[PDB]
């Protein structure tokens, strides 16, 4: 739909009836199709078909058949308890989904790509979707194009970053009148857009683990049900008793709300993270951040502050006595609303008497090449009152000399002093900037170096120290030379193994064997003189060795690296494209925020893992107890008691998402074989405890075994199962022994209340025909505590360079060699 | 670590004693006497 | 000669199908490599001779 | 008697020597590059 779907001259050319700057009277627009068309607003706030949706399903059908086959509404004892359990599961699921969907949207709101349109006044900006179609737009150097459309008549070329919706990853340089694609970035440019198709033709991992776990649990429940049905067939049980058995085992076996409570834990953790100034794009980024082993962070803005200190410019040069300040400030963009960190320090340190007032007047800029990362060099051409074209150049100290090597070519008197001074200021931890000037058509003097300095953030050193205890390995990425990077590493205690990116082999190699360039990249404390492509190459290499890499991105240059990284982190002050391509967007600066978010994500993952182990352990426990007891002895717990056991497993679990869970000291990952081993062993231990409990009463009579004065088997088993099952959470939510960390008051209270309810059930026996002695419950508590201790001890006991053989090194060498020979041949002699 | 492993051993012994007393339907007082004796002998009070 | 409008997504989905598409061009290496970059086919192009 | 009875060169395989060689070599190449020709 182009012409008949909301597009013609009056939303196209009537846009360009005013000047560039101005817009008035969004009049009667007749249609606001802007808010992610029919995606979030699709069937708005139904809020009642989610409730009934939880009442329909495989297990819910089994429960409905159970509640119907209880002689209908004859008596409110079996029907009442079964419908109560079904209602409780439905309500808990609905509340959890509501909480998880009402808090992931609050993170979406605080991260929407706000869009700027300039009207008569200095209009701030327009919130993303509520912008009228057929309206002007200002896409400015790394902003996600809010609305699809075409360019405005003004002449300028913007390099739109594509391959998000198209194929080519290179410069897709639409110039004038072409189709500008929405939800795409702009690498560089300054153009205006006319809106067309404002919402038309816009062309995790824990969930899969949960799905697999649920499938295996279903398999286990089916196996148990098969045992029960076979053993009932051999005994010729009436169909009603078989149905009661299968209902009990269906209730205990399949966890109704495992993925729901896992998503609730993720959502609560994401909300807590966003409270800590760390907004998560996709809910799956929590696990990815918890799993990262290497954090490749840019030095500027993360490991150090963006404000620079200037210390005595090196004005020791030839004829040029003081021109450093004047010519360097000549190359200032002076916008004061889009200038970078480098530009500010020149203006703040312009306390110069002779000509600093007269140097900013009449020096009209003709050409201003922006700072190119591949060149590390800003070049400006301006006018002067003398009439000359002073082409200022400013960049890395060596690159300025590489620029001035043509005229006045490398005199030994000045070049040696220049290199010695830049090395000396590297030793002093000073960022240096060189400047060269062009008076005439054949003059090229070298002015000198400018010793800027940006100190590390006051919390950076201890943050890096603690990051080594967390299992991370921080790899700094500097565009600076090797000397400055190495001195910064010495200052930060980051270790001094800094390799120049181009020399090492990131990209076009230097005939370094491929098996060892990967080894150097893996064991490297940093990378100096890094270009945008080297970031992606570093991420690609580090993942081959088997790591999970977290990249600190900022700006549109490192968007592909952010996408390729397992956890792309958009640091403070990033552009719209950088945070759109990242996984976690930060609203606080420094590495301290990143490390705090890492610790929080590890805590959230610990909560998730502890709950999963809890759920499947008690599932295995209670299924291999009840199924075995039915098979061997044609007996099972009373249906009301087993329903209440299931309920108690949905009360002590709506609190796991809110507790003081500790964080692992090493990167944490889904070790599914170890998870299943631990859970099967815990369930087997619990089942052995329960079987001992019941075989005591077989051995010494109904009221003579684990019970002392009087009791009944069913309520005693109820109490033992409830205690040993709910107390299992205290050992899964710990690092080592269960007494290491103190559980939160909420979890402890919710579990102690359930324990009190189970004890009252046993003492007064209000679902069976007899009560239990007050000393029998004491003995059951003692035995359950012993089982808890042995189970926790089992859980605690089992809780705990070239990275390649000949095959791996050969493979990496072959990969790098084939890349190099492809380049070599492609050169075609 | 040694104390933790010794605690594990004492808990295992106490579990054996309590299970074997449950099968014999020992009165709670005798079970408590047994567990007191084994607690006294098992955990070293002043090793560290 | 531009690629067919369905070629890029076809090559993307062919990687999920287990295939590995090997282009054969009579062109020089540079044109083939640029076409591979356009199509998302990966850039390891070797002159046959 | 039981207590008494039970009472009682390059130090590396290929892996260890390779690891130490790699460590020293990476130190040297880091210094070499840091010199920056
Ligand atoms: N705006 C600028 N004008 C001139 N030189 C610059 C500018 N920004 C950075 N440089 C120089 O380029 C080199 C590193 O630039 P960069 O790659 O930007 O460091 P970072 O990537 O850590 O911001 C240093 O020599 C620095 O002084
Ligand atoms: N009919 C032709 N006349 C001249 N040059 C041709 C002709 N057909 C192809 N070429 C050139 O030969 C080279 C490839 O030819 P070919 O081997 O035909 O490509 P394809 O095999 O992909 O059709 C290219 O340089 C192409 O321009
Ligand atoms: K990613
Ligand atoms: Mg930087």
Numbering used by the authors:
A (entry chain F): 66 to 268, 284 to 880, 892 to 920
B (entry chain A): 292 to 339
C (entry chain E): 534 to 582
D (entry chain A): 873 to 880, 892 to 920
Could you pull the original sentences from the published paper?
We collected single-particle cryo-EM data of the hexameric form of Pma1 from Neurospora crassa plasma membrane in its autoinhibited state and obtained a hexamer map at 3.28-Å resolution. The Pma1 hexamer forms a ring with sixfold symmetry, with a maximum outer diameter of 167 Å and an inner cavity measuring 24 to 55 Å in diameter in the cytosolic and transmembrane regions, respectively. Monomer contacts are mediated by both the cytosolic domains and the transmembrane domains. Specifically, there are two connections between the cytosolic domains: a loose contact between the conserved Thr-Gly-Glu-Ser (TGES) loop in the A domain (residues 231 to 235) and two α-helix termini in the P domain (Tyr541, Arg570, and Gln571). The second, more extensive contact between the P domains of adjacent monomers is mediated entirely via the autoinhibitory R domain (and see further discussion below). The interactions in the transmembrane region involve residues in M3 of one monomer, and M7 and M10 of the adjacent monomer, augmented by two polar contacts from Ser316 and Asn317 in L3-L4 to Gln780 (M7) and Arg859 (M10). The R domains are closely sandwiched between adjacent P domains, forming an extensive interaction network. R domains of adjacent monomers interact directly: Ser892 and Pro893 interact with Leu902 of the adjacent R helix, thereby linking all R domains within the hexamer. Opposite this dip, on the inside of the ring, the cytosolic membrane surface bulges upward toward the P domain, probably attracted by the partial positive charge at the N-terminal end of M3 and by Lys749 in the L6-L7 loop. Both the “dip” and the “bulge” are also evident from the cryo-EM map of the micelle surrounding the Pma1 hexamer particles [likely consisting of a mixture of β-dodecyl-maltopyranoside (DDM) with residual membrane lipids]. We find no structural basis for cooperativity between the monomers in the hexamer, but the structure implies that autoinhibition is enhanced by—if not dependent on—a hexamer context.
The plasma membrane of fungal and plant cells contains a proton-pumping P-type adenosine triphosphatase (ATPase) that maintains the intracellular pH and generates a proton-motive force, driving the import of nutrients by secondary transporters. Unlike any other known P-type ATPase, Pma1 is a hexamer that localizes to specific ordered microdomains in the fungal plasma membrane. Autoinhibited Pma1 hexamers in the plasma membrane of starving fungi are activated by glucose signaling and subsequent phosphorylation of the autoinhibitory domain. We have determined the structure of hexameric Pma1 from Neurospora crassa by electron cryo-microscopy at 3.3-Å resolution, elucidating the molecular basis for hexamer formation and autoinhibition and providing a basis for structure-based drug development.
